[PDB]
Design an enzyme around this catalytic site. Sequence first.
Site, PDB file in Angstrom:
ATOM      1  N   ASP A  59       0.858  -1.173   0.000  1.00  8.19           N
ATOM      2  CA  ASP A  59       0.000   0.000   0.000  1.00  8.19           C
ATOM      3  C   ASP A  59       0.899   1.229   0.000  1.00  8.19           C
ATOM      4  O   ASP A  59       2.064   1.164   0.400  1.00  8.19           O
ATOM      5  CB  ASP A  59      -0.924  -0.002   1.219  1.00  8.19           C
ATOM      6  N   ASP A  61      -0.289   5.036   0.748  1.00  4.53           N
ATOM      7  CA  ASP A  61      -0.647   5.959   1.818  1.00  4.53           C
ATOM      8  C   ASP A  61      -0.699   5.216   3.147  1.00  4.53           C
ATOM      9  O   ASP A  61      -1.465   4.261   3.307  1.00  4.53           O
ATOM     10  CB  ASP A  61      -1.987   6.623   1.494  1.00  4.53           C
TER      11      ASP A  61
HETATM   12 MG   LIG Z   1      -3.104   2.975   3.418  1.00  3.66          MG
END
Ligand SMILES: [Mg+2]
Lengths: 242, 242
Positions: free
Chosen positions: B8, B10
């Site tokens: 991922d 962010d």
């Molecule tokens: Mg995230």
Amino acid sequence: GPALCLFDVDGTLTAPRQKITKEMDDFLQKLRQKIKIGVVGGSDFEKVQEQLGNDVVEKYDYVFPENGLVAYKDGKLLCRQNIQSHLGEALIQDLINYCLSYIAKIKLPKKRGTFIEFRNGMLNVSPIGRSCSQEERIEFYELDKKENIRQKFVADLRKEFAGKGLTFSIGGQISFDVFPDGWDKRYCLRHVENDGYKTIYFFGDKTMPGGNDHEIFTDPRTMGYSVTAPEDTRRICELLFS
Amino acid sequence: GPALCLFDVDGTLTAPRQKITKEMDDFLQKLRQKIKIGVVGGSDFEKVQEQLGNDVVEKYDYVFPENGLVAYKDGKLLCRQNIQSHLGEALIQDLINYCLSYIAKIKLPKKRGTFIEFRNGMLNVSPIGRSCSQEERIEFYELDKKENIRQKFVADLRKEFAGKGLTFSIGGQISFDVFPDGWDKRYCLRHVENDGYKTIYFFGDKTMPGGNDHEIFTDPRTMGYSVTAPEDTRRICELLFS
Ligand SMILES: [Mg+2]
Ligand SMILES: O=P([O-])(O)O[C@H]1O[C@H](COP(=O)(O)O)[C@@H](O)[C@H](O)[C@H]1O
Ligand SMILES: [Cl-]
Ligand SMILES: [Mg+2]
Ligand SMILES: [Mg+2]
Ligand SMILES: [Mg+2]
Ligand code: NA
């Protein structure tokens, strides 16, 4: 008596889709010692800043972006207006609600996105949606010449909302525009009519019907002068003010 | 066999709504010497570039913006699919027409424009309108906490379109997303599965039921690992590959 020179921006002070040249910017700044000058365009203040420089408010006596819905006079903001404040939230919603309900019942080959584009001066309603491809625009522009989709939608809207001071105008390939009556380029005259100008010259290139300059040119409060390009705008201004 | 690290973006490599630190960016490049690495997020390609660098497609072996509806491998864009082609124009129009008639019936303080936004891998639906101002956005967010507007609109949709292979997810402040079933972060595995890897690690900060990393954390093709911040992703990776 004292006169003002109002100019359309695109096509008149600038070649289409191009920024003002240093030679024309200087011509106007020198014409400003003779007469008061001002500009009017349908684009937001950021595009007027890309087309005439980020210092436009300090170089033109009047700046009327968005057909004058935003107004500047002598370096300060004179006025600010938008369609939601004028018409009110109730009527705004009643128009959007009828349009959304109406577009939902239109049988189209394709429906994409952005069926309503809220601009400060109008509402651009698209049965297909402005987010469609160019190949889909053309697919709908031909289906509309046959089934007259935009005409019937605008005719039902004229019957339901036009006593509220609303004008509807089919244009382009995929949409029509809904703006308060008179919110074309003519709206900017209301900020200069009370300033004591015996004559207000106006210069634009789309001065024939169906143009964005036509209504301001046909108005009796202007001395209109059609133009063809920025060299021609400097040609007429030499013949008029020396 | 060989392995791949899917991250991922962010909250996993970067801190919330922040760019990656040059410390974490240089650590990931020292890990790439020992294992092919990849990144996946829900954001458009230009937002992944603002968080990880404008040359992300050359710093990472796999780059999966828009959950993988847009996918880069070794620098070149891979085959692409869109929500129109998967669901069909009929279901698309039927969902758009239903959403439009529903929005025309919501009693809100303000309604503006772009109620439906057609994206590659989903349709975004704003009861208020995406073109809304920051002030109008907060207004609708707080009202919706009290009146549960978004919540009820998604419940009706789950009902009307039951069994049609669509998922609905309320995110953010003014909208909810409608995407084909499986077009969450798991979509990108279709480009790394059966590509030689015997283990495909995944890292995410939102791996709980209802998070954007949940289904790709629980998908059996992956070796999920739940992280708290960029510094924790470093800790687990130094435990696994050092
Ligand atoms: Mg995230
Ligand atoms: O706030 P909006 O309506 O513009 O919503 C925006 O953010 C949401 C998630 O945001 P977050 O994870 O930060 O809560 C997304 O689901 C949505 O597609 C996007 O338009
Ligand atoms: Cl819309
Ligand atoms: Mg012009
Ligand atoms: Mg006239
Ligand atoms: Mg797993
Ligand atoms: Na963007």
